[PDB]
Ligand binder design. Structure first.
Ligand code: YVO
Ligand code: ZN
Ligand code: ZN
Length: 232
């Protein structure tokens, strides 16, 4: 009823949207992994009379439910999607999107890692993002490669019209006591990558983590703190 929706409030298989700013929504879904249930976020950005999707809803059935919820709540077609790293909470559902006519994109680094790991593979490669600090425009957003953090390929997304920074899994929510799933992370480089984000997007007003509640710029420093302490 207006609060940001949380893990125990979303049954696995259902999707909720949350209005972040004019023409910007997050999407929230839940999934089970190794016997525990987790929420995860993505983004939706209005692109004229079309929509740009950032990240799947973590699984084929969740992503079908996402498309249905978008049609119910927004009613504009999703024409393109970008996956921000190669894990299943970002690409799981790409096959569903591709069969619904959505053009799917990711960096070549993400596409190679997804293919090698057996995850679903976005169709189109996003060049111009291979060096830390790189940025490219993609419809109504800017894509930025900050360096290795949660994964070596992780991208962040900025919506300049609304000063919304979608950090993906390289950014953690404020209540987080942990660095999350660090299986593919670079804990040594992560603070440096966060510092690059902070330097590049100093006017961000909303910061959205890959899992959990949005907040302000403090999420970035908090993320560096939690990662450094995890490493310690
Ligand atoms: C799918 C995602 C995934 C699956 C399940 C959980 C997560 C989490 C997470 C977020 C917050 C949080 C925790 C975990 C615990 C905690 O306490 N708070 C995150 C994230 O941090 O982005 N990603 C998760 N995979 C799986 C894996 C690939 C590798 C295969 N060998 C293992 O690596 C990930 O990232
Ligand atoms: Zn991940
Ligand atoms: Zn994640």
């Amino acid at each position: 009823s207006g609060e940001y929706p949380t893990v125990n409030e979303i049954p696995v298989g259902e999707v909720r949207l949350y209005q972040i700013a004019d023409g910007v929504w997050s999407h929230i879904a839940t999934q089970s992994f190794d016997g525990a249930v987790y929420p995860s976020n993505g983004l939706i950005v209005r692109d004229g009379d079309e929509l740009l999707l950032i990240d799947t809803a973590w699984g084929a059935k969740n992503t079908a439910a996402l498309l249905a919820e978008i049609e119910k709540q927004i009613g504009l077609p999703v024409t393109r999607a970008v996956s921000t790293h190669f894990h299943d909470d970002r690409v799981g559902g790409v096959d569903v999107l591709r069969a619904a006519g959505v053009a799917t994109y990711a960096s070549p680094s993400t596409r190679r890692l997804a293919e090698a790991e057996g995850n679903e593979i976005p169709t189109h490669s996003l060049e111009g993002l291979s060096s830390s600090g790189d940025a490219v425009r993609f419809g109504p957003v800017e894509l930025f490669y900050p360096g290795a953090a949660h994964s070596t390929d992780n991208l962040v997304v900025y919506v300049p019209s609304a000063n919304v920074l979608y950090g993906g899994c390289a950014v953690h929510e404020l209540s987080s006591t942990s660095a999350g799933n660090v299986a593919d992370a670079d804990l040594a480089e992560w603070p440096t990558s966060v510092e690059r984000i902070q330097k590049h997007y100093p006017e961000a007003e909303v910061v959205i983590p890959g899992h959990g509640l949005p907040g302000g710029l403090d999420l970035l420093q908090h993320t560096a703190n939690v990662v450094k302490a995890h490493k310690n």
